[PDB]
Amino acid sequence: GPHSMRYFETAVSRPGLEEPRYISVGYVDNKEFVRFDSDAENPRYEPRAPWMEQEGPEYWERETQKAKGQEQWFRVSLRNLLGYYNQSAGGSHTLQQMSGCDLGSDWRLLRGYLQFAYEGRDYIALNEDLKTWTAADMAAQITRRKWEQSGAAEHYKAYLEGECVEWLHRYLKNGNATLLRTDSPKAHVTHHPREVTLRCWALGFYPADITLTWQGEEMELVETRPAGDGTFQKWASVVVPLGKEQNYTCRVYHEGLPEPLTLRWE
């Protein structure tokens, strides 16, 4: 199966605070596995999955040190961006970064990622070629020219194609315990006297991606939502004429399933 790693980094400044607050969260196959937060009493990368305790103190000291550097980087960048956008003193501002790699089922690098957002909006991103930059805003051209001039792309490309892949392999080897499993959904339908409303529930599944469809032909649904125990929930409903209860069937599609479920009101 395919696999992925990401690091999602955020720096926030507020009118009150003197210095911004820096947070970094690492993910493997979309499950959180490490975390740094500068508001913490003793700022450090802490493990977040059980299988990560296997790393000795040199790992944690090293990564922590990188984090302290990123905090420096985000602080300065925030400062420069303020100037670029002619923003004045006395506002909240935020800067966000996503970086990482995608692997195919053969464990080869499918694609690398490296994008930034300012005030929640795309600021600059590294194209799929890991050589050129895309940046919409006129203000963002200043950073584009700077980074093109200095060879920034090559050093991100090296990380994304090397370290990112290399260490993700290692984490997966260590995670041939907790991460192998995907949880199939368990489906059931409920009745409500709206005409009546039929509601197809899907419960206890991982990962979140899932599809629900009523039939017949191709409705009200809610956004997929975490149960809070590592699994997810979703439902889809339709309004139906009273008595015509069995013309309608629900279908559930999920990667854990050997095949799609088919169910109706029992």
Partner: peptide
């Protein structure tokens, strides 16, 4: 292992 960044914006 986390990336570290080069030129500041």
């Amino acid at each position: 292992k986390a990336p570290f960044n080069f030129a500041t914006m």
